[PDB]
Every structure is written in structure tokens, then in C-alpha cells.
Design a protein around this nucleic acid. Structure first.
Lengths: 148, 199, 265, 35
RNA sequence: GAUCUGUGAAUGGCUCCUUACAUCAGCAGUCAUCUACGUGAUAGAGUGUGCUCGGUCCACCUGCAAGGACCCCAUUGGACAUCCACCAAAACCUUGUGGCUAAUACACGUUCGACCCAGUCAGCCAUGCAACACUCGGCAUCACCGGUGGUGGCGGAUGUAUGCCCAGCUGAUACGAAGACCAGCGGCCGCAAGGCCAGUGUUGGUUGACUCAGGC
RNA sequence: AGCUUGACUGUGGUGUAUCGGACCACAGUGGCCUUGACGGGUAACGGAGAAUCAGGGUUCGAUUCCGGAGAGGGAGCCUGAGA
RNA sequence: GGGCUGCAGGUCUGCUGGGUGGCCGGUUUGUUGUUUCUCUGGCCAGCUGUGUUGGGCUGCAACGGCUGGUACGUCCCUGCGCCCACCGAUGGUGAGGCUCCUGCCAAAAGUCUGCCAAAGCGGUUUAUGCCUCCCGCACUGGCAACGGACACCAACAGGGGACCCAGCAGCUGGGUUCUGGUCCACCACCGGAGCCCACCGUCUGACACCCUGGAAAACUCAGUGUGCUCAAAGCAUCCCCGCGACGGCUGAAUGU
């Protein structure tokens, strides 16, 4: 789906040298066909998707297979829509308490969040997304878990 | 001089010389503990080693102990492709040679002669340079100028230590290792019996 | 036009300096030395306001540039040098020997000490890195480097350095049971043994401490300071209350009794 | 020298304890299977 | 006094015109960064090839594989200031020219601040299967005799300091059972032959996380 | 009551001290909105705070402390660690 | 859910319409009298003790002065104390770990109602300047250490050295040490069972809300202490000394 990229350049992974004569088994994964893949385990109590570890897609701005570090807030939202490429709109309906009238308001916030190609998701699924460096004008969060 | 936790200075074979017996003891700064036990004894340790501690006192021989008793010699830095026969040649003028054990992983050798005298002779043969065989008629790098020392390591005592280690091994594993031994002798002789038969 | 600011207003001064708000518009802005600006005492505050040798700013400059105020075993002439926690301040011409510590109220006191206590210091490891040519070092809270520590000296430990040589003399682990002191937050200046460390990966771990008597408080792991392997062996002398904070009714009664018994004469 | 000495000390001690166990376990069970 | 150089003038003081998620407050991140003063450590550059090759002095033959005699280390150069003198302009906190004369200015320079080791080049030794491959030598691809290969070592030349940049490697593991065989390498029984497996120490920091630190 | 067309995302570069449509080239058609977008107004610099205040709240805060902006209006720079 | 062994009151049970005072519990305040105890400085017996002066501190103790003079057992209700229903885990490594048990069989009695302990018996088990790895690779290193009583000579097994002999570190012998008679205490290594910590893995919705803890600029506000003459304030003051001195305790809490 979004594993597809442009055919204007040869998209390779940064830290994997594809023409190594005698490479090591450090990135030979325990379920792959010998395909070497650099990945990491972001470590705030999250699990690296098997799709990321054993996949073929190339994604900078992916938190598992690229230099993008997850640090800062980690929020929970709902996928409003997926109409950008590898980016997805996420909404947080929260309740803001007005002090004078001792009641609450329905408020919301959207986020252009970056879904890596390691995540299966349908529109409406819940998402936990952690903050990364600015990846675009509005994108500064990566999707760390999709919950059906 | 054996100093592990208890320094033991020695004089002679038995309590013959024994003049530093009370000297160290009444030595105020140097030693509070006193010297005896058939040889001189302290439980003390200062910043030195025997190396010069001997001359520190400068009053006696300072020679238990055992030397000149060896039927074996150790030979030192030994070029890569040396051979047991080459060592036998290199130590033939010292006497008749009983055993030689060449260690390439250590670049050394053990030469078990037949008599202590031959070993003493071959320490004197430290001066002689090496030549695996050949002759001194042609000169090159082959002169190696080995080192030679005396060794307390004999055929009998190595036999004893060998079985001592083989049975410091487990009690149940040796036979299970022997059941690994017998299947090797079998499975090797197996296709050997089938070798000449099938052909 | 903007760069680094050079002044510190008297109101914006750290409150743990009992700076009087009417005695001047400015306060001496600490220099960027070893200690943090809000966890430090300027040498002018130690010389003029506490140990009133200097009657004012001019005489403080004089005393300090005359090169006889020694802080951590070396002379410091900067009137704004940020002397902080666990530093030793000697004045030889006077025979003064202090270790700057925290009282139970969270202020910097100058605890008078003796010979061996002045000949070493106690500093907590905050960072552990490797420099070029494979040089393992450990950065402490006094900002110093200690370019070759023992390999088994992990981060939150404390170290006993000899202020003469500047090398490491001892070190104390941060495991549960160690005697410990608080250096920030509300509970600063309190001493209590470590009871348990709650982990919070990605944020601040929390440390639960049992006071010398039986009280219990909590603080942050980057907020604690190890002093001693246990409550029996403090690696440094300790002030009058020994880090035992009193209740506020107890403190009020203590102040009242002191004032009354003093007025008695 | 410190790190290398402590590495060699570890090897010396670990091997010593291991051989102690090898000659203790399998010489306890020696006589207990004998009699 | 002056002057050159260094450093400060980016702080402070004033005002509230602008500015409506903008500013700001509290919280948090920099694993996406910069840094004078301050402070704690650090610091070994004759260095584009093994040598010729830091500089001169000889050699040999489209260079060499072991060859030499000295020299460097009591520390550089050229300016422009203050000064003197002639001055342009109505002025200007505008300015020209000529002659000296300084440096922590500017330029320039660096042996003894290393030693050893790795590595790179070359040579040699001991011993071993073998007639297979690629060749040096003789002929215009059918061809006849040497050379290199395996293993274990020694060694003559040097001893590539560091930052930036690019590429490759590393930056581990913390779950778990046994055999055969062919090569080599050890060790054991061995005079040896031959068999064999009881011994057996002579590479990893940080973080919650890294392509990070550090190292080759 | 609809707003936006570098507008929103992506790939490859540029530039920067650094991330980033910040800029560019090529692709796509996105992005916000009655939970008030976009626009307009300023008896708008923001906050700490001030005045009242049973409680809940009301009004103010140019002004000393912190942050921002400016130096007649604009804009461009050099020096420097920093404008 | 049944319940109730077990504290106070209530279910129960019989009462109380007396007028002062000192003494005693406790030290309650200005006093003395200790000095438990650090600390202080020398002297004195080769920095540790030993008495000591100075203030600190109170195990306190009195003196005027004192003030303070509803009950057992019984049916249950909470605070707890229990018996009686049915069907998050696991795996490694260390930590510059802790605790417990720990040689053989086992009387009777003990337990579960044929298994199993407690706990004496008996001897088999243990004591170096030594041993072990290394022995010329580093190894002067690593490893390993659980008594007395009574009182006696000598055999034995084993280990050990320095000097000399015969033949294929050896024996052959001869030329200067550690265990032999009982009792109690022990019982090492090896191992077993938990607990605590740090790290590394596998598998079976999210929040509001309330409570608790941790984090948080000052000035202002509230508030603690303090006679700037009071007050608004400030963060300082206060005490000794006045005959003459080379000072002392300090405070600047705390909160919303």
C-alpha cells in the first residue's frame, strides 16, 4: 500500500550497506529470509512491530527503522482520516472544565501524525503517537501503536 | 624465599647457620614479629619483594629449596617449524635423549634426558646457538640463540598428573565419554571393514 | 540586540539567600562556575553576609583578590564564584574551615569542620562518558571530570575526592540502605536512609527515604545525594540537627524557648 | 593494568570455583553411588 | 598622559506602538542545535608511499631492500601607530603625505614533545602433500622443463600525532539438545609407526530508545 | 460561514547552528471549519499581580519582577560568542 | 453468608440530692545539686588512656509555690481476632546480596490417617610454616582453614633434604619433622529453600472521578518571631561586657 514509493531514486536504509562482502548476522532477523534490516526498539514500553522488523519498506520518519527518536509527549487519539501519503489525521476529543459553570466542554485537537508502513489500520482505529522531531510543517508525531 | 602471607627467609639445609634468629625480632622498625619455625618467619609485609629484600639484610646466604636434581630441561624461544628430531639433534652432544615434547603454541620444548648430569651440561649448552640441522658452513638467520633452564617434569610424574586430571574429571562423565570413545573406534573401524569388503 | 544577561535583580535573587529586598536593587549574579546559579552561594555572600569580614562589596573584592579565600583546596578571587553544595571553604589567615551544607530548612549553612574533613570532599557522579583515546570519565555535580574512575562506579553514586590531588579516594553506591541527603525540592536539607526507588522510565524516578528518627518522605532520584554507606557511617560531618527536620509547631516552640531563655538574662 | 588484572583475577577465581564444584559434586556422588 | 593590541559597548535604562495560539504562563524536548567570559580535565604534528622524501653532501640504472658525512635549537620578518615635519578644508567626532620606532597586532616558522606497538614494504628459515591452476623464461595456440600454493615462525625499512569531510566495520549476549566426516591448528599416548580428544587464560560505554559516545 | 493554493503530505536536494515548505525540483490533492474556521475590533503587550470578594464570582493589570517588541517609518548589513 | 470466641457503650442488674481543706500522682515556675554523655586544652604512663578547667546536656531531685482526686459478667454493632465456598505466570545474568537448613541409617513416642519429621544413640567423617593450579610462561598470584579438658613412653603408616654408592628427580641404603588414649564442640567444600535488588525476554480497551505522594521564581497575600518610641514598616534583632576588650546564641518558619 504505502510501502510503494517513488521510482526517481533508489530508496535504501541508512545503516545497512547492501554490497557487503562478508556481512554479519547482526541484522539477520529471526523470521526473515536472510534480508538484513536495521531497526531499533523505541523503549517507552512499546513493542517493535514484526511488520517493521521483517518488512521491506523504506521509511525515514519511521520510529522503528530510521534515526527518528521518540521523546516528549505520548498522546492517544482517533484516526479521523488517511488522505495524505504516510501521514494521517488524528483527533483528540477531550473535555475542558469551565470553572464558573461547574461543567465541561467538548473540545478537540487534530494532528497530522506520521504512520509508518509497519501498521495496519482502518479509519476510526485508536492510536498512541509519540512526539519526534519536526518532520514537516505540521507533522511532529509518529504513530507508535495502532489499537483496533 | 617464599612470601605469600608468611615470609620465610632460609639459611642452609638445616639449623646450621642460624645467626639472624633474634636480630630481626629485636629489630624495632623493621620487624615486630619474631623469626623461628626451623627457619625465619614473619607475618609482615612492607613495600619490597625478595628481589632486594635479600640484600636489605646483607648478612647471610638466603638460598625449602631444590635444584640440580632435574632429569629434564626446558628449551625456550623456538622457531616455528622445529621438530622433535631437530631437538634430539640439537641436544645429542649433551647425552642420550629419552623424551622430547615440542609446544608450538608456546614456542618451547621439554627435553627429558636420562640423567641429572646431562641437564646441567645442556644449561651450559645455552651458549650454543640453534640450527634445526644443517651446518655452520653456511651462515644466515638460522642461529636462534635459545634459552635453556632445568625442569622438574618427568615421564613418571606426568603420567601420574595425567591420570590425576583424567580422574579429577567427573565420575559419571568419563564412562559416558568412554561411550563416546568406543563409538568412535567402532564407527571408524565400521566403514573400514566395509571399505575392503565392498571393493 | 540581545546576548547573555549580566545582572540579577535583588527580587529575582534565589530566595535561599536571605537577601533583603530593600538593601539594594541588584544582587551579585553568580558566575557560570562549578555549581548551578540557584544551588550556589557567591563568595561575596559567604564573605560579606555570613562571615561578616567584608562590611560591603568593596571589602569583599579586597578580601577575595588578596588570594586568601580558598574554596575546594584552591584560591578563588572571583567575587561571584558559585560555591555550592559540599564545597570546603578555608580561610587560613583566620583558621576558618567550613563545609557548605544544607540545613533542614533548605538554606546553605557553613558547617565548621576539622583537619581530615577539610582535606577531602564529597561529590556525586551525575554523568558517565568516554572521551577520545577511549578515556572513560565520570562527570560529577561539581562539574569535574575524574578522567579515570573505577569501572564499577555507576551513575548516581557518590565519591570522596582528596582536594589536594583531585583524584578519587573512595566512592559509595546508591543501593537501598545507603545514608542519603536531599539537595532540592521541599525536602532539601533532610537526611534519611534509602528505602525504595520507584522507577519511571522516560521521566523522574522517585526515592522514598526514612528520616533519622522515623519520619518518611519522598523526592527525586536526581534530587537525592548519597552521604554514607549507612546511618552508622556518614562519609562527612553533619550539622546540629543531623538532617532531622522538625515539625513547624516544634520549631515554633524551639524558637520561643530560645528567645525566652535568652531574655532570661 | 587495573582492568586487565581484575579480568585475570575473575578468570582465576571463576575457574577455581568451577573446578572446586567439579571435584566436589562428582566426588560426593562418587562415594554415594559406591555405597 | 599618549598609542597600538585585548576586551566591553548585545548588559543596564526607557516605552507599550504593534501583536488574538500570536505574545505569554505552567509542562516538556533537543536522540534536531550554537556558545566569549566562568570552571574541571586534556594536549608528544620533521610525517601524501617501507625507502629514496626535514636540508645539503655521494651513489646505482628507465630506483633500493640494506649504504653512509654532516646541519637544524639562544627565539623570525615586514609594517603602521604614539612622535617629528609639511599640510588640504569654512567647517566636519572630515582628511592627505614624508621619516623613524614596538608587540600577546599582522604575517611567518616548529626535532630532539616522545617511546613502543599496529600496520605497510621486503627478505629469510623449518617442514609438508602434490603433478591441478596461473604464469617468468624458448614458438605463428595444437604445445615440452623449472616458479608460486599449505602450515609454523623470524625478521631488515618505517613506526602516520589530531580536528573537519566521505565510505566501510564495531558499539555483543542475558533460553535451550547430541553426533559423524574432509581439510588444516593444538594437545595426549607415543622411540617411531599410527591412533586419539583427557587438558586447554595467555575485544562491548550511554540511554526509556540511537545511525549516539568512543574505537578500527 | 465557508477559509487556504506553498495552501496540506511525500521523495530528492538546498540552506541553517540545527529540525522543518524555511526554500527549491518533481509527484499527489490535500489542510481547517457551528466543539466557530477565515475575517473584523482593541475602553489588547502577556503573566506574576491589584481592587473588592460568605460562597460562586466581577472588574482591572501602560507601570517596579519575568517574558516579548521597538528605538522617527521601513529595509539591508558589518563586527562579534552573541545584534 | 453463617457466625461468634474476645475490648467501650448500649439488652439486663441495684445505686447516688454529703460542706471545706491539705497531701499525692507529676517535677508544674525563679532557684540550687548532680553530671549519665560527646566535645575543649595541656600535663602525665609509649596519636590511646588517666583525673582536671570552661561552658554544653539533663536519669533527674526537691523548696516557696502547686494545681488534676459511674461497676462486673451476660443475648450482638462497628475498628479488629478467627473457622466454615467453589474454580498475572514463567525463563536467564549479576549484586564493588541477605537469611535459613545442610554427612549414614532411625527406637519409642510425633504427625497425615501406607508417607513423613523432631531428636540422642554408633562409627564411618575434618585441623600446619600446609595444600592445590603454575612450576620456569605471568603464579611472592588465585583457591582452600570448625576447640578444649586429662596427662604418658614407644612402635607404626605417610610426607619432607643435604651427601654419596649401582643399574636401567626413580629406586638402594645409610650421614639435621607432623598425627596414635578417651569425653564434650564441631561439622568444611559440595548442596538444598526462600527473600530483596538491577538488567534482559514471552504470553491474557482508554479516561474522567476521588485519595496519596512527588515537581514548582522572588516581590505581593496569608501567616510564624521580633517594642523601628507605637503604627504603616523592616528582616533583623537579643544576651554578656561598661570595672574594661580580643565575644555568644541566633532568626530570616510556613502556606494558599
Amino acid at each position: 500500500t504505502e510501502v510503494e514509493l517513488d521510482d526517481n531514486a533508489f530508496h535504501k536504509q541508512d545503516n545497512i550497506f547492501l554490497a557487503a562482502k562478508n556481512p554479519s548476522s547482526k541484522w539477520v532477523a529471526p523470521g526473515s529470509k536472510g534480508r538484513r534490516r536495521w531497526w531499533k526498539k523505541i523503549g517507552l514500553g512499546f513493542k517493535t512491530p514484526k511488520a517493521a522488523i521483517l518488512g521491506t519498506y523504506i521509511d525515514h520518519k519511521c520510529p522503528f527503522t530510521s534515526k527518528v527518536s521518540i521523546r516528549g509527549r505520548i498522546l492517544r487519539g482517533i484516526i479521523i482520516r488517511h488522505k495524505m501519503f504516510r501521514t494521517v489525521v488524528v483527533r483528540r476529543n477531550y473535555l475542558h472544565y469551565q470553572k464558573k459553570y461547574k461543567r465541561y466542554e467538548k473540545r478537540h485537537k487534530n494532528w497530522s501524525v506520521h504512520i509508518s508502513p509497519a501498521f495496519d489500520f482502518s479509519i476510526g482505529d485508536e492510536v498512541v503517537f509519540g512526539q519526534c522531531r519536526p518532520l514537516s510543517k505540521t507533522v511532529t508525531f509518529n504513530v507508535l501503536q495502532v489499537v483496533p | 624465599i617464599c612470601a605469600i602471607l608468611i615470609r620465610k627467609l632460609d639459611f642452609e639445609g638445616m639449623s646450621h647457620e642460624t645467626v639472624k634468629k633474634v636480630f630481626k625480632s629485636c629489630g624495632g622498625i623493621v620487624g615486630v614479629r619474631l623469626r623461628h619455625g626451623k627457619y625465619t618467619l614473619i607475618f609482615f609485609k612492607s613495600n619490597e619483594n625478595a628481589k632486594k629484600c635479600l640484600e636489605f639484610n646483607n648478612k647471610v646466604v638466603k638460598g625449602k629449596k631444590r635444584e640440580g636434581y632435574c632429569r629434564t630441561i626446558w628449551v625456550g624461544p623456538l622457531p616455528g617449524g622445529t621438530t622433535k628430531e631437530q631437538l634430539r639433534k640439537h641436544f645429542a652432544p649433551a647425552g642420550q635423549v629419552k623424551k622430547v615434547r615440542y609446544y608450538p603454541s608456546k614456542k618451547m620444548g621439554f627435553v627429558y634426558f636420562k640423567k641429572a648430569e646431562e641437564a646441567l651440561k645442556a644449561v651450559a649448552m645455552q651458549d650454543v646457538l640453534f640450527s634445526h640441522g644443517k651446518d655452520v658452513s653456511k651462515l644466515e638467520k638460522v642461529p636462534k640463540q635459545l634459552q635453556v633452564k632445568l625442569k622438574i617434569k618427568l615421564s613418571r610424574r606426568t603420567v601420574t598428573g595425567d591420570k590425576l586430571k583424567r580422574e579429577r574429571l567427573y565420575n559419571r562423565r568419563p564412562p559416558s565419554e568412554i561411550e563416546r570413545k568406543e563409538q568412535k573406534s567402532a564407527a571408524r573401524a565400521a566403514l573400514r571393514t566395509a571399505a575392503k569388503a565392498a571393493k | 540586540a540581545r546576548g547573555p544577561k549580566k545582572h540579577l535583580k535583588r527580587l529575582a535573587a534565589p530566595k535561599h539567600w536571605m537577601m533583603d529586598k530593600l538593601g539594594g536593587i541588584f544582587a551579585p549574579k553568580p558566575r557560570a562556575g562549578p555549581h548551578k546559579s540557584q544551588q550556589c552561594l557567591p563568595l561575596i555572600l559567604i564573605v560579606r553576609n555570613r562571615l561578616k569580614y567584608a562590611l560591603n562589596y568593596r571589602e569583599a573584592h579586597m578580601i577575595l583578590k588578596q588570594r586568601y579565600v580558598k574554596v575546594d583546596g584552591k584560591v578563588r578571587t572571583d567575587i561571584k564564584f558559585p560555591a555550592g553544595f559540599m564545597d570546603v571553604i578555608e580561610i587560613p589567615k583566620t583558621g576558618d574551615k567550613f563545609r557548605v551544607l544544607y540545613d533542614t530548612k533548605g538554606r546553605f549553612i557553613l558547617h565548621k569542620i576539622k583537619g581530615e574533613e577539610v582535606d577531602f570532599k564529597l561529590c556525586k557522579v551525575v554523568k558517565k562518558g568516554t572521551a577520545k583515546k577511549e578515556t572513560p570519565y565520570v562527570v560529577t555535580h561539581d562539574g569535574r571530570t575524574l578522567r579515570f574512575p573505577d569501572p564499577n562506579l555507576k551513575k548516581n553514586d557518590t565519591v570522596v575526592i582528596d582536594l589536594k590531588t583531585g583524584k578519587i579516594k573512595e566512592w559509595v553506591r546508591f543501593k537501598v540502605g545507603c545514608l542519603l541527603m536531599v539537595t532540592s525540592g521541599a525536602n532539601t536539607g533532610r537526611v534519611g536512609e534509602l528505602v525504595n526507588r520507584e522507577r519511571h522510565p522516560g521521566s523522574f524516578d522517585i526515592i522514598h527515604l526514612k528520616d533519622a528518627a522515623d519520619n518518611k518522605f519522598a523526592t527525586r532520584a536526581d534530587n537525592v545525594f548519597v552521604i554514607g554507606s549507612s546511618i552508622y557511617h556518614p562519609l562527612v560531618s553533619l550539622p546540629k540537627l543531623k538532617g532531622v527536620k522538625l515539625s513547624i509547631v516544634e520549631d515554633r516552640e524551639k524558637k520561643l524557648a530560645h528567645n525566652s531563655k535568652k531574655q532570661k538574662q | 593494568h587495573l582492568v586487565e588484572r581484575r579480568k585475570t583475577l575473575n578468570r582465576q577465581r571463576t575457574k577455581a570455583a568451577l573446578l572446586r564444584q567439579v571435584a566436589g559434586r562428582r566426588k560426593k556422588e562418587l562415594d554415594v553411588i559406591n555405597k
